[PDB]
Amino acid sequence: ASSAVITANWISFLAISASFIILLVISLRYKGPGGTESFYNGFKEQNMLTVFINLWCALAYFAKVLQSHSNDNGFAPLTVIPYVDYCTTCPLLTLDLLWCLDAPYKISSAVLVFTCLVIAVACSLAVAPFSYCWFAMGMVLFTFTYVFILSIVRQRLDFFTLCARDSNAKQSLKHLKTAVFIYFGIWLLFPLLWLLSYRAANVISNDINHIFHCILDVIAKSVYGFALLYFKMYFDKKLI
Ligand SMILES: *C/C=C(C)/C=C/C=C(C)/C=C/C1=C(C)CCCC1(C)C
């Protein structure tokens, strides 16, 4: 691979590894809002989802780093077949988002995201013009999923803001809004990147697409999980 590609892969792998190790340490040391439960997150494993996500992401990038230094394909599921790592991660991200917000249809939303990602995987491994049909079907399903998840997220954000008066509550709400903006705005770029890649309109080269994918992953995973975590710890739920 090119110097830029290997450098971006190494930077992304190191960033996600550091983020995973910090999130795991914080989760293990977290003692709950009361500061008395030794294993608060042990009996609430959903709070660990973020951590696992990062770990999986890190592993994926590790494989990429190996593929960056060898002429032969590395771990095919995480390097060869596109969007499989996303198939594994993004549904967990949606589940975590709708769990911290106590939103309805969290499992339904996660399954919809998984189905959209599997449709995308089929589209990326298809041959034109059938690839266009797969992309159109995925686009309709993702439009429906995006509208549904936004409607739930907006209604939970309004509910949370209605009963958030403490300064710490306001700070946690700002972090939650930052995480929501990262989740919604950034996710819209992935379809734009696919439609702008060598597939369909070939304008952006492979290297720039890969670097943009790495940056979007790093942001929308590391910063997203950190914000979610700031919000979960520093937002009193009993204010409902
Ligand atoms: C950490 C990585 C994440 C959250 C990746 C998310 C990716 C998507 C939401 C991708 C969506 C796509 C479509 C809606 C259309 C087909 C092409 C995709 C896979 C880019």
Side-chain angles (χ1 to χ4, degrees), residues 16 53 57 61 82-83 85-87 89-91 93-94 113 116-121 123-124 134-143 146 182-183 186-195 199 213 216-222:
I16 313 272
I53 286 160
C57 198
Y61 275 107
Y83 298 100
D85 42 321
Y86 297 162
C87 279
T89 37
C90 321
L93 281 165
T94 302
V113 163
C116 288
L117 281 157
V118 170
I119 288 172
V121 164
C123 172
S124 325
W134 265 118
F135 188 69
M137 190 71 145
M139 205 63 252
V140 194
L141 189 66
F142 181 67
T143 307
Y146 189 96
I182 279 167
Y183 180 88
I186 307 301
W187 277 42
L188 283 178
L189 297 169
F190 282 100
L192 178 61
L193 283 176
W194 186 99
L195 261 157
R199 311 192 188 91
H213 274 263
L216 288 203
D217 275 335
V218 169
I219 293 173
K221 292 173 166 76
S222 304

Coordinates of all heavy atoms in Angstrom, one line a residue, residues 16 53 57 61 82-83 85-87 89-91 93-94 113 116-121 123-124 134-143 146 182-183 186-195 199 213 216-222, ligand 1:
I16 N -7.9 4.0 18.1 CA -9.0 3.1 18.5 C -8.5 2.3 19.7 O -9.3 2.0 20.6 CB -9.6 2.3 17.3 CG1 -9.9 3.2 16.1 CG2 -10.9 1.6 17.8 CD1 -11.2 3.8 16.0
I53 N -17.5 -2.5 21.0 CA -17.5 -1.9 19.7 C -16.0 -1.5 19.4 O -15.4 -2.0 18.4 CB -18.5 -0.7 19.6 CG1 -19.9 -1.2 19.5 CG2 -18.1 0.1 18.4 CD1 -20.9 -0.2 19.9
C57 N -13.6 -2.8 16.4 CA -13.1 -1.8 15.5 C -11.5 -1.9 15.5 O -10.9 -2.1 14.4 CB -13.5 -0.4 15.8 SG -13.3 0.7 14.4
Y61 N -9.0 -2.8 12.3 CA -7.9 -1.9 11.9 C -6.6 -2.7 12.0 O -5.7 -2.6 11.1 CB -7.9 -0.6 12.6 CG -8.8 0.4 11.9 CD1 -10.0 0.8 12.5 CD2 -8.5 1.0 10.7 CE1 -10.9 1.7 11.9 CE2 -9.3 1.9 10.1 CZ -10.5 2.2 10.7 OH -11.4 3.1 10.1
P82 N -16.1 -5.8 2.0 CA -16.4 -4.5 2.6 C -17.7 -4.5 3.5 O -18.5 -5.3 3.3 CB -16.6 -3.5 1.5 CG -16.1 -4.3 0.3 CD -16.3 -5.8 0.6
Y83 N -17.7 -3.6 4.5 CA -18.9 -3.3 5.4 C -19.2 -4.5 6.3 O -20.2 -4.3 7.1 CB -20.1 -3.0 4.5 CG -19.9 -1.8 3.6 CD1 -19.6 -1.9 2.3 CD2 -20.0 -0.5 4.2 CE1 -19.4 -0.8 1.5 CE2 -19.9 0.6 3.4 CZ -19.6 0.5 2.0 OH -19.4 1.6 1.3
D85 N -17.2 -5.5 8.9 CA -16.9 -4.9 10.2 C -18.0 -3.9 10.6 O -18.4 -3.8 11.8 CB -15.5 -4.2 10.2 CG -15.3 -3.4 8.9 OD1 -15.7 -3.9 7.8 OD2 -14.7 -2.3 9.0
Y86 N -18.5 -3.1 9.7 CA -19.6 -2.2 9.9 C -20.9 -3.0 10.3 O -21.6 -2.7 11.2 CB -19.9 -1.3 8.7 CG -18.7 -0.4 8.4 CD1 -18.6 0.3 7.2 CD2 -17.8 -0.1 9.4 CE1 -17.6 1.1 6.9 CE2 -16.7 0.8 9.1 CZ -16.6 1.4 7.8 OH -15.6 2.3 7.6
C87 N -21.1 -4.1 9.6 CA -22.2 -5.1 9.9 C -22.1 -5.4 11.4 O -23.2 -5.5 12.1 CB -22.2 -6.3 9.0 SG -22.9 -6.1 7.4
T89 N -20.4 -3.8 13.9 CA -20.3 -2.6 14.8 C -21.5 -1.8 14.8 O -22.1 -1.5 15.9 CB -19.1 -1.8 14.5 OG1 -18.9 -1.8 13.1 CG2 -17.8 -2.4 15.1
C90 N -22.0 -1.3 13.7 CA -23.0 -0.2 13.6 C -24.3 -0.6 14.4 O -24.9 0.2 15.1 CB -23.3 0.2 12.2 SG -21.9 0.3 11.2
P91 N -24.8 -1.9 14.2 CA -26.0 -2.3 15.0 C -25.8 -2.1 16.5 O -26.7 -1.7 17.2 CB -26.2 -3.7 14.6 CG -25.6 -3.8 13.2 CD -24.4 -2.9 13.3
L93 N -23.8 0.1 17.9 CA -23.8 1.6 18.1 C -25.3 2.0 18.2 O -25.6 2.8 19.2 CB -23.1 2.3 17.0 CG -21.6 2.3 17.1 CD1 -21.0 2.7 15.7 CD2 -21.1 3.2 18.2
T94 N -26.1 1.6 17.3 CA -27.5 2.0 17.4 C -28.2 1.5 18.6 O -29.0 2.2 19.3 CB -28.3 1.5 16.1 OG1 -27.6 2.0 15.0 CG2 -29.7 2.0 16.2
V113 N -30.7 -1.6 11.0 CA -29.3 -1.2 10.7 C -28.5 -2.3 10.1 O -27.8 -2.2 9.1 CB -28.6 -0.5 11.8 CG1 -27.1 -0.4 11.6 CG2 -29.2 0.9 12.1
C116 N -29.7 -3.2 6.6 CA -29.2 -2.2 5.7 C -27.8 -2.5 5.4 O -27.4 -2.4 4.2 CB -29.4 -0.8 6.2 SG -31.1 -0.2 6.2
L117 N -27.0 -2.8 6.4 CA -25.5 -3.1 6.2 C -25.3 -4.3 5.4 O -24.4 -4.4 4.6 CB -24.8 -3.2 7.5 CG -24.5 -1.8 8.2 CD1 -24.4 -1.9 9.7 CD2 -23.2 -1.2 7.6
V118 N -26.2 -5.3 5.6 CA -26.1 -6.6 4.8 C -26.5 -6.3 3.4 O -25.8 -6.8 2.4 CB -26.9 -7.7 5.4 CG1 -27.0 -8.9 4.5 CG2 -26.4 -8.1 6.8
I119 N -27.5 -5.5 3.2 CA -27.9 -5.1 1.8 C -26.7 -4.3 1.1 O -26.4 -4.6 -0.1 CB -29.1 -4.2 1.8 CG1 -30.4 -5.0 2.1 CG2 -29.3 -3.5 0.5 CD1 -31.6 -4.2 2.4
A120 N -26.0 -3.5 1.9 CA -24.8 -2.8 1.3 C -23.7 -3.8 1.0 O -23.0 -3.6 0.0 CB -24.3 -1.7 2.3
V121 N -23.5 -4.8 1.9 CA -22.5 -5.8 1.6 C -22.8 -6.5 0.3 O -21.9 -6.7 -0.5 CB -22.4 -6.8 2.8 CG1 -21.7 -8.0 2.4 CG2 -21.7 -6.1 4.0
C123 N -24.6 -5.3 -2.2 CA -24.4 -4.3 -3.2 C -22.9 -4.2 -3.7 O -22.6 -4.2 -4.9 CB -24.9 -3.0 -2.8 SG -24.6 -1.6 -4.0
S124 N -22.0 -4.2 -2.7 CA -20.6 -4.0 -2.9 C -20.0 -5.2 -3.6 O -19.0 -5.1 -4.3 CB -19.8 -3.7 -1.7 OG -20.6 -2.9 -0.8
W134 N -29.6 -3.2 -6.1 CA -29.3 -3.5 -4.6 C -29.1 -2.2 -3.9 O -29.6 -2.0 -2.8 CB -28.0 -4.4 -4.5 CG -28.3 -5.8 -4.4 CD1 -28.0 -6.8 -5.2 CD2 -29.0 -6.5 -3.3 NE1 -28.4 -8.0 -4.8 CE2 -29.1 -7.8 -3.6 CE3 -29.7 -6.0 -2.1 CZ2 -29.7 -8.8 -2.7 CZ3 -30.3 -6.9 -1.3 CH2 -30.3 -8.3 -1.6
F135 N -28.4 -1.2 -4.5 CA -28.1 0.1 -3.9 C -29.5 0.8 -3.7 O -29.7 1.5 -2.6 CB -27.2 0.9 -4.7 CG -26.8 2.2 -4.0 CD1 -25.9 2.2 -2.9 CD2 -27.2 3.4 -4.5 CE1 -25.6 3.3 -2.3 CE2 -26.8 4.6 -3.9 CZ -26.0 4.5 -2.8
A136 N -30.4 0.8 -4.7 CA -31.7 1.5 -4.6 C -32.5 0.8 -3.4 O -33.1 1.6 -2.6 CB -32.4 1.4 -5.9
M137 N -32.5 -0.5 -3.4 CA -33.3 -1.1 -2.3 C -32.7 -0.8 -0.9 O -33.5 -0.4 0.0 CB -33.3 -2.7 -2.5 CG -34.2 -3.4 -1.5 SD -35.9 -3.2 -2.0 CE -36.6 -4.8 -1.6
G138 N -31.4 -0.8 -0.8 CA -30.7 -0.4 0.4 C -31.0 1.1 0.8 O -31.2 1.4 2.0
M139 N -31.1 1.9 -0.2 CA -31.3 3.3 0.0 C -32.7 3.5 0.5 O -32.9 4.3 1.5 CB -31.2 4.1 -1.3 CG -30.8 5.6 -1.1 SD -29.2 5.8 -0.3 CE -29.8 6.4 1.3
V140 N -33.7 2.8 0.0 CA -35.1 3.0 0.5 C -35.2 2.5 1.9 O -35.7 3.2 2.8 CB -36.1 2.2 -0.4 CG1 -37.5 2.6 -0.1 CG2 -35.8 2.4 -1.9
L141 N -34.6 1.3 2.2 CA -34.6 0.7 3.6 C -33.9 1.7 4.5 O -34.4 1.9 5.6 CB -34.0 -0.6 3.6 CG -34.1 -1.4 4.9 CD1 -35.6 -1.8 5.1 CD2 -33.3 -2.7 4.9
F142 N -32.7 2.2 4.1 CA -32.0 3.1 5.0 C -32.7 4.5 5.2 O -32.6 5.0 6.3 CB -30.6 3.4 4.5 CG -29.8 4.3 5.3 CD1 -29.3 3.9 6.6 CD2 -29.4 5.6 4.9 CE1 -28.6 4.7 7.4 CE2 -28.6 6.4 5.7 CZ -28.2 5.9 7.0
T143 N -33.4 4.9 4.2 CA -34.2 6.2 4.3 C -35.3 6.0 5.4 O -35.5 6.8 6.3 CB -34.8 6.6 3.0 OG1 -33.8 6.7 2.0 CG2 -35.5 7.9 3.1
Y146 N -33.6 5.7 8.8 CA -33.1 7.0 9.2 C -34.3 7.8 9.8 O -34.1 8.5 10.8 CB -32.4 7.7 8.1 CG -31.7 8.9 8.5 CD1 -30.3 8.9 8.8 CD2 -32.3 10.2 8.5 CE1 -29.6 10.0 9.1 CE2 -31.6 11.3 8.9 CZ -30.3 11.3 9.2 OH -29.6 12.4 9.5
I182 N -23.1 13.7 15.7 CA -22.1 12.8 15.1 C -22.8 11.6 14.5 O -22.5 11.2 13.4 CB -21.1 12.4 16.2 CG1 -20.0 13.5 16.3 CG2 -20.4 11.1 15.8 CD1 -19.2 13.4 17.5
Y183 N -23.7 11.0 15.2 CA -24.4 9.8 14.7 C -25.2 10.1 13.4 O -25.2 9.2 12.5 CB -25.4 9.3 15.8 CG -26.1 8.0 15.4 CD1 -25.6 6.8 15.6 CD2 -27.4 8.1 14.8 CE1 -26.2 5.6 15.3 CE2 -28.1 6.9 14.5 CZ -27.5 5.7 14.7 OH -28.2 4.6 14.3
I186 N -22.8 12.4 10.3 CA -21.6 11.6 9.8 C -22.1 10.4 9.0 O -21.6 10.1 7.9 CB -20.7 11.2 10.9 CG1 -20.3 12.4 11.8 CG2 -19.5 10.4 10.4 CD1 -19.5 13.5 11.0
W187 N -23.2 9.7 9.5 CA -23.7 8.5 8.9 C -24.2 8.8 7.4 O -24.0 7.9 6.6 CB -24.8 7.9 9.7 CG -24.3 7.0 10.8 CD1 -23.3 7.2 11.6 CD2 -24.9 5.7 11.2 NE1 -23.1 6.2 12.5 CE2 -24.1 5.2 12.2 CE3 -26.0 5.0 10.7 CZ2 -24.4 4.0 12.9 CZ3 -26.2 3.8 11.3 CH2 -25.4 3.3 12.4
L188 N -24.7 10.0 7.2 CA -25.1 10.4 5.8 C -23.9 10.5 4.9 O -24.1 10.4 3.7 CB -25.8 11.8 5.9 CG -27.3 11.7 6.4 CD1 -27.8 13.1 6.5 CD2 -28.1 10.8 5.6
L189 N -22.7 10.6 5.4 CA -21.5 10.8 4.5 C -21.1 9.4 3.9 O -20.7 9.4 2.8 CB -20.3 11.3 5.3 CG -20.5 12.7 5.8 CD1 -19.4 13.1 6.8 CD2 -20.6 13.8 4.7
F190 N -21.3 8.3 4.6 CA -21.0 7.0 4.1 C -21.7 6.7 2.8 O -21.0 6.3 1.8 CB -21.2 5.9 5.2 CG -20.2 5.8 6.2 CD1 -20.4 6.4 7.5 CD2 -19.0 5.2 6.0 CE1 -19.4 6.4 8.5 CE2 -18.0 5.1 7.0 CZ -18.2 5.7 8.2
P191 N -23.0 6.8 2.7 CA -23.6 6.7 1.4 C -23.1 7.6 0.3 O -22.9 7.2 -0.8 CB -25.1 7.0 1.6 CG -25.3 6.7 3.1 CD -24.0 7.1 3.7
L192 N -22.8 8.9 0.7 CA -22.2 9.8 -0.2 C -20.8 9.3 -0.7 O -20.5 9.4 -1.9 CB -22.1 11.2 0.4 CG -21.4 12.3 -0.4 CD1 -22.2 12.6 -1.7 CD2 -21.3 13.6 0.4
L193 N -20.0 8.8 0.2 CA -18.7 8.2 -0.1 C -18.8 7.1 -1.1 O -18.1 7.0 -2.1 CB -17.9 7.8 1.2 CG -17.3 8.9 2.0 CD1 -16.7 8.4 3.3 CD2 -16.3 9.7 1.2
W194 N -19.8 6.2 -0.8 CA -20.0 5.0 -1.7 C -20.4 5.5 -3.1 O -19.9 5.0 -4.1 CB -21.0 4.1 -1.2 CG -21.2 2.8 -2.0 CD1 -20.6 1.6 -1.7 CD2 -21.9 2.7 -3.2 NE1 -20.9 0.7 -2.7 CE2 -21.7 1.3 -3.6 CE3 -22.7 3.5 -4.0 CZ2 -22.4 0.8 -4.8 CZ3 -23.3 3.0 -5.1 CH2 -23.1 1.7 -5.5
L195 N -21.3 6.5 -3.2 CA -21.8 7.0 -4.5 C -20.7 7.8 -5.2 O -20.8 8.0 -6.4 CB -23.1 7.9 -4.3 CG -24.4 7.2 -4.5 CD1 -25.5 7.9 -3.8 CD2 -24.7 7.1 -6.0
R199 N -17.0 3.0 -7.7 CA -18.4 2.6 -8.0 C -19.2 3.8 -8.3 O -19.0 4.9 -7.6 CB -19.0 1.7 -6.9 CG -18.1 0.6 -6.4 CD -18.9 -0.4 -5.6 NE -18.1 -1.4 -4.9 CZ -17.5 -1.3 -3.7 NH1 -17.6 -0.2 -3.0 NH2 -16.7 -2.3 -3.3
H213 N -12.8 7.3 5.2 CA -13.4 6.2 6.0 C -12.7 6.1 7.3 O -13.4 6.0 8.3 CB -13.4 4.9 5.2 CG -14.5 4.7 4.3 ND1 -15.7 4.0 4.6 CD2 -14.7 5.2 3.0 CE1 -16.5 4.1 3.6 NE2 -16.0 4.8 2.6
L216 N -13.7 9.1 9.5 CA -15.1 9.0 9.9 C -15.3 7.9 11.0 O -16.0 8.2 12.0 CB -16.0 8.7 8.7 CG -16.2 9.8 7.7 CD1 -17.5 9.6 6.9 CD2 -16.3 11.2 8.3
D217 N -14.6 6.8 10.8 CA -14.7 5.7 11.9 C -14.1 6.2 13.2 O -14.8 6.1 14.2 CB -13.9 4.5 11.4 CG -14.7 3.6 10.5 OD1 -16.0 3.6 10.6 OD2 -14.1 2.8 9.8
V218 N -12.9 6.8 13.1 CA -12.3 7.3 14.4 C -13.2 8.3 15.1 O -13.4 8.1 16.3 CB -10.9 7.9 14.0 CG1 -10.3 8.6 15.2 CG2 -9.9 6.8 13.5
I219 N -13.7 9.3 14.4 CA -14.5 10.3 15.0 C -15.8 9.6 15.6 O -15.9 9.5 16.8 CB -14.9 11.4 14.0 CG1 -13.7 12.2 13.5 CG2 -16.0 12.3 14.5 CD1 -14.0 13.2 12.4
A220 N -16.6 9.0 14.7 CA -17.9 8.5 15.0 C -17.9 7.3 16.0 O -19.0 6.8 16.3 CB -18.7 8.2 13.8
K221 N -16.7 6.8 16.3 CA -16.6 5.8 17.3 C -15.9 6.3 18.6 O -16.6 6.3 19.6 CB -15.8 4.6 16.8 CG -16.6 3.8 15.7 CD -15.8 2.8 15.0 CE -16.6 1.8 14.2 NZ -17.1 2.4 12.9
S222 N -14.7 6.8 18.5 CA -14.0 7.3 19.7 C -14.8 8.5 20.4 O -15.2 8.4 21.5 CB -12.6 7.7 19.4 OG -11.9 6.6 18.8
Ligands
LIG1 C1 -18.3 2.8 12.7 C2 -18.8 2.7 11.4 C3 -20.1 3.1 11.0 C4 -21.2 3.6 12.0 C5 -20.6 2.9 9.7 C6 -21.8 3.2 9.1 C7 -22.2 3.0 7.8 C8 -23.4 3.2 7.2 C9 -24.6 3.7 8.0 C10 -23.5 3.0 5.8 C11 -24.6 3.1 5.0 C12 -24.7 2.9 3.5 C13 -25.9 3.1 2.9 C14 -27.2 3.6 3.6 C15 -26.1 2.8 1.5 C16 -25.2 1.7 0.9 C17 -23.8 2.1 1.2 C18 -23.6 2.3 2.7 C19 -23.1 1.0 3.3 C20 -22.4 3.3 2.8

